[PDB]
């Protein structure tokens, strides 16, 4: 047999872990991304691209370190090591945030390899590849927020930096500038993620309490681990309970386990649409009726106008050192204050 | 013409109507706030 | 406040068109049994 087939069979051998063709893209890209983050939160600075400190070497604890995005003066640069901005010099390349693009691109390729790994395993076992389809929700999220959005703004500077507090900063920046909570697609996302956790808890509890042979000296033994369950309980019991409490229940197990797949996945997809909308700075910030009524009448207050005042504050007090490359300097008689209202 | 041999019917049972109508009317309540502005 | 004359038409169509679509399929498949 030809050399291709020998090679192909050896990639598909029975091992502790399957390598497969998808492994060839998966393992280097994933390992190098993961190591890149590990050496960055441990040695690499951010002192020349944000004026912040985020390294164990600089002295910081687990929550305040990050591998940080490049400057705004780099534009949409790919930041290659051999490219014409670091020109083959390692120290400059770590200092200029080139390690950020390293992680982002290698992690995208790791995600591609992983969905391909799910297909490959599904096809050699011969099951339907539904778990790969489920894994398109993370990919949607990832390519919309770490790649598509910064490619719409002005640089990679507004891309979300890899880090704990660095992502906590993303939340306030979105809350203040775009008013993300008022966007309907994010509303649909919050409902979907909470709905997924809701089905998780309810399923987990009501299968646990309706088992066949919870006493009786259970005389069933197999297991048959791939079934996961879904014969170790009586469906009829479950239905008959829920159909009395909430007044509706499932009666078909297949559609239950498809609804569980459907809900949190659709959630993330709607939010992924929402944030690719923000990339063009197409946001819903306000309702036009409330603004005209509030301009015509200032004895009008709602919880929504209130949100507008708070957002107005977030921006002006965070921006002068969140965005230091803009060189905002704001006197303390122009910064917003509640007691001036 | 002569009948198509690939003619199959289309189904929709009651519980799908309930679910589907719920989704339509609920989606309207969410986006109507933004249509009226 | 200015409320759109066309916001109402969007609302109206958004509900009425899909609802009558699903309903017609349902009554069609009910006459398929009887």
């Amino acid at each position: 047999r030809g050399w291709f087939d020998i090679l192909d069979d050896w990639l598909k051998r029975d091992r502790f872990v399957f390598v497969g063709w998808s492994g060839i893209l998966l393992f280097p890209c994933a390992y190098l991304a993961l190591g890149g983050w590990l050496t960055g939160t441990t040695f690499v600075t951010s002192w020349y691209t944000h004026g912040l400190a985020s390294s164990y070497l600089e002295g910081c604890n687990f929550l305040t370190v990050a591998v940080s995005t490049p400057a705004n003066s780099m534009g949409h640069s790919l930041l290659l090591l051999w490219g014409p901005e670091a020109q083959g010099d390692f120290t400059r390349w770590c200092q200029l945030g080139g390690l950020w693009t390293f992680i982002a691109l290698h992690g995208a390729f790791g995600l591609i390899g992983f969905m391909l790994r799910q297909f490959e395993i599904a096809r050699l076992v011969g099951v339907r590849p539904y778990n790969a389809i489920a894994f398109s929700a993370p990919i949607a999220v990832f390519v919309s927020v770490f790649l598509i959005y910064p490619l719409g703004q002005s640089s990679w500077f507004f891309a979300p930096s890899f880090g704990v507090a660095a992502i906590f900063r993303f939340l306030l920046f979105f809350q203040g500038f775009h008013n993300w909570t008022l966007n309907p697609f994010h509303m649909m996302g919050v409902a979907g993620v909470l709905g997924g956790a809701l089905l998780c808890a309810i399923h987990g509890a009501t299968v646990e309490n309706t088992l066949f042979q919870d006493g009786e000296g259970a005389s069933t033994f197999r297991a048959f681990n791939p079934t996961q369950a879904e014969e170790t309980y009586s469906m009829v019991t479950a239905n008959r309970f829920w159909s009395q409490i909430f007044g509706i229940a499932f009666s078909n197990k297949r559609w239950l386990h498809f609804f569980m797949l459907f809900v949190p996945v659709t959630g993330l997809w709607m939010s992924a649409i929402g944030v690719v909308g923000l990339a063009l700075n197409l946001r819903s910030y306000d309702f036009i009726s409330q603004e005209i009524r509030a301009a015509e009448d200032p004895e009008f207050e709602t919880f929504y106008t209130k949100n507008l005042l708070l957002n107005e504050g977030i921006r002006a007090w965070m921006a002068p050192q969140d965005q230091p490359h803009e060189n905002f300097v704001f006197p303390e008689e122009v910064l917003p204050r509640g007691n001036a209202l | 013409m002569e009948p198509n041999p690939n003619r199959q019917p289309v189904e929709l049972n009651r519980t799908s109507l309930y679910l589907g109508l719920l989704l339509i009317l609920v989606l309207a309540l969410l986006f109507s706030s933004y249509f009226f502005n | 406040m200015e409320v759109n004359q066309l916001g109402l038409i969007a609302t109206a169509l958004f509900v009425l068109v899909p609802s009558v679509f699903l309903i017609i399929l349902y009554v069609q498949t009910e006459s398929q049994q009887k």
Binding site: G247, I248, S251 | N13, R14, T15, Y18, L21, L22, L25, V26, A28, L29, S32, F36 | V3, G7, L8, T11, V15
Partner: peptide, 28 residues
Amino acid sequence: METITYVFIFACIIALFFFAIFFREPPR
């Protein structure tokens, strides 16, 4: 204009609740 539309859509949800409880499809 707007508020009638809001309460009408509400009213038909709660009607749909009633229909789903006391007129479900007999599963046979």
